[PDB]
Symmetry: C3
Subunit: 209 residues, 3 copies
């Protein structure tokens, strides 16, 4: 009998989870360029497949954490990165779901912009995951990705706030107002969830400083 | 002075919490067969008593966890099972609350079906709790309860999605639409919370495999 | 080379976080006495500054926890106190945000009462933080602050329930109903979040009993 090392690849799993997030964000942006129910259902089904894969990967990370004593940085942060990235994926899925069930009129430029900001956050998150092996030597690149996520969330919240303010001043059809309010709310929660990933990363830098 | 063992009965407490959940689910199903405010208030008060008992039990589990060094399986999973079961109970309570404050017209077959699916999930959860002592020897029965919870949640989400889709196509009274949308949303969140219990159990099997 | 002690002041940080919460609650109460958008935006901006400071302090606590092996009481409870106090601050911020974006008519006495109850909870939380150093010797004062938080939340939920019940019976303008429903919902979630702080404190007493 001999010693056989465990190969929990926490970094590759976090990178794969980030890849799913980015793929999901691309699908959401594309979906909003289509207005009919059949096409919206197709995008939702594709996003749901990404959601199932993200959930699988997230649970694999948690299961590897629960059974491995040695981790590259503190286990709470690994757990939290995984859970928060999965929350973004779930927000993207919920947004697609709502578009299908509410069947709003063609999504305005503001909804489309929230989708583009979610994708920009996903790109920043993916680049941040490439820094997990080296932030202890040089935290600057990671730090800057965190600042960018913060800035994107400020822009997203403004887009959302201005849209809702105007929606309530202008839209007299209460049923259409409800539809788009619920979709837009899910989109803004998603952009906020993505910023929380940045917040975990920022504080990871602090803990190891 | 001698050694006196601590008898933290984690399994009995989890089973009692499951019993509260099941009792709550029975009350919710029954409540929907009554349409008048006085009867709905009575059911809500009864469910609220179950919610208080569930919250008590959940906090007892957490308090026993915080003071006991030895646990039958990992403490995070015990904590999470308790918290997630309590979330289902709280969702049932919130659903009953909403029915009282919104005072909708008699609940449709779709709302009633979501209540029946929550109860079916509660039954599966109760049977799963009977497997905590033996899943390490034979995980198959537990595994199968997890699969069933997954399937019930798929059915619940479809019930919800189809109802909302139709609601927005047909209901021209925006105030009635709001009432039932909020109740139905709480019901679908409850069915999803119950599936999360299954997800924790499924991964418990994986961790100990 | 010599030993240099780490001065993580967990109690002072929790007290400062409580101070931010209380300051935020004062601003929310004051804000509701003003009905025009410019004044509401000003209060929201001031509350948002408190939200940023609360979030900073919360993350400082978490970062000190992640790097310090010795804590005055269990780390999970410190983490949870910080996170739950921050959730109240965030609820106050969300409430102010909603008032700005929805632009409702002058807030009724019920909304104003929910703001006064949030402030009363904040006061109780601040007094509770003064008991963290001594609850092990004498838990009675802390216990009583927890009971008060519980009672305030019962009153808040009743205020909310009665307001919504009446709102749905009386308000025929669906767009105005939506505005105030969303604000009131955020206010009641905030009062509930504050009660959760009391629940953590109550169970802290139990764990150390």
């Amino acid at each position: 009998s001999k010693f056989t090392p465990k190969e929990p690849k926490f970094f590759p799993l976090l990178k794969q989870l980030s890849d799913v997030l980015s793929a999901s964000s691309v699908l959401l942006v594309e979906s909003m360029e289509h207005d009919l129910p059949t096409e919206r259902a197709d995008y939702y089904k594709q996003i749901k497949d990404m959601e199932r894969e993200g959930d699988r990967l997230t649970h694999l990370i948690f299961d590897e954490l629960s059974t491995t004593f040695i981790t590259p940085f503190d286990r709470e942060d690994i757990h939290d990165l995984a859970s928060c990235m999965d929350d973004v994926i779930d927000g993207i899925n919920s947004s697609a779901k709502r578009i299908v069930i509410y069947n709003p009129r063609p999504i305005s430029e503001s909804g489309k912009e929230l989708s583009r900001l979610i994708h920009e956050e996903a790109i920043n998150i993916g680049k941040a995951m490439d820094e997990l092996e080296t932030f202890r030597k040089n935290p600057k690149p990671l730090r800057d990705y965190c600042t960018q996520l913060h800035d994107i969330e400020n822009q997203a919240d403004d887009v959302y706030e201005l849209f809702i303010t105007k929606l309530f001043e202008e839209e007299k059809d209460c049923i259409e107002l409800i539809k788009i309010k619920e979709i837009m709310h899910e989109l803004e929660k998603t952009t906020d969830a993505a910023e929380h990933v940045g917040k975990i990363l920022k504080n990871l830098i602090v803990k190891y400083s």
